[PDB]
Design a protein around this nucleic acid. Structure first.
Ligand code: NA
Ligand code: NA
Ligand SMILES: [Zn+2]
Length: 327
DNA sequence: CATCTG
DNA sequence: CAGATG
């Protein structure tokens, strides 16, 4: 956690780059289990040969660890941090809609900057365009003070459209957090579930509402169950407009909301633990359901849930207010 | 995983 | 349809 930190981090830069710049998914994958195990390891790696002793710990990586242990740095790492072609891809990639693949293509087309981007707005698709257009706002964190205002609206509109709608803002926002990076709404309706053959209007009617009153600004992607968008809290009394925020809305069959809601609320660490305990208690949990474990090895059959409560109960645990769902 | 592009 | 992004 700090005894093998540098090692783990270097491996991290390394792994990362393999994947992003080079295409080296193997290599890339290599660095990763390696950092992973070194990460676990209870001692102070004092040499490469010592490391080597580990699994995922090959010869090359050991070598690397040596030079790093030997001297406060790594040549290769130094060589990669410089290289404009590398840095380019790390940067282009910051654009919502641009991934590595794309970051590569452009650079080899010579697009390497924001400007470049604008100049070539013809070459980007819709998401990418939006991504570019709001590059700044998009990197800005979201203060819970705004979150509540947001949340405030979404909920009232969902309401007006149908009293029966069920909306929930999950996320860290949900677990307490002072700021969040995006608004994530879990949505369901009685009239929608596991068997119930579809109902797209279910998701599309609210989307519409939100754009109605202009809360929703743009559409990143709009499917029948998940919508990727952009929103914004009406600029008050003109002088202070708000940043454009990323936002997601997703329809859930009523018969699987809470596992969802639970799941989406995190934290990753809380899940796992919760997950592991369910397992003890003779169960299984995932994003959609909780099932009683047969002994034959495994086994299914969806336990029935009406709240986050029903879940804990199942695994017979202390209900946790979201705030304390940290770890 | 669900959506988009081409 | 494969392949990309979030
Ligand atoms: Na991006
Ligand atoms: Na292939
Ligand atoms: Zn020791």
């Amino acid at each position: 956690e700090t005894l093998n930190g540098g090692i783990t981090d270097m491996l991290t830069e390394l792994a990362n780059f393999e994947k992003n710049v080079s295409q080296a998914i193997h290599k890339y994958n290599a660095y990763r289990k390696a950092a992973s195990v070194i990460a676990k390891y209870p001692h102070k790696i004092k040499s490469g040969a010592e490391a080597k002793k580990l699994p995922g710990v090959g010869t090359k990586i050991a070598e690397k660890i040596d030079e790093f242990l030997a001297t406060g740095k790594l040549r290769k790492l130094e060589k990669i941090r410089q290289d404009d072609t590398s840095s380019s891809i790390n940067f282009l990639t910051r654009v919502s809609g641009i991934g590595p693949s794309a970051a590569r293509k452009f650079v080899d087309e010579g697009i390497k900057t924001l400007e470049d981007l604008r100049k070539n707005e013809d070459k980007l698709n819709h998401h990418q365009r939006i991504g570019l257009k709001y590059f700044g706002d998009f990197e800005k964190r979201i203060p819970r003070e705004e979150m509540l205002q947001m949340q405030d609206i979404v909920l009232n509109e969902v309401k007006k459209v149908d009293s029966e709608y069920i909306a929930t803002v999950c996320g860290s926002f949900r677990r307490g957090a002072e700021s969040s990076g995006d608004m994530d709404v879990l949505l369901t309706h009685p009239s929608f579930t596991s068997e119930s053959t579809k109902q797209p209007k279910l998701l599309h009617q609210v989307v519409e509402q939100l754009q109605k009153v202009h809360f929703i600004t743009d559409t990143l992607s709009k499917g029948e169950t998940k919508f990727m968008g952009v929103c914004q809290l009406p600029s008050k009394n003109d002088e202070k407009e708000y940043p454009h925020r990323r936002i997601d809305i997703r329809l859930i069959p009523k018969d699987q909301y809470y596992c969802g809601v639970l799941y989406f609320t995190g934290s990753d660490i809380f899940n796992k633990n919760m997950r592991a305990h369910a397992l003890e208690k003779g169960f299984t949990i995932n994003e959609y359901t909780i099932r009683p474990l047969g002994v034959t090895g495994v086994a299914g059959e969806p336990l029935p849930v009406d709240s986050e409560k029903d879940i804990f109960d199942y695994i017979q645990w202390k209900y946790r207010e979201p705030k304390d769902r940290s770890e």
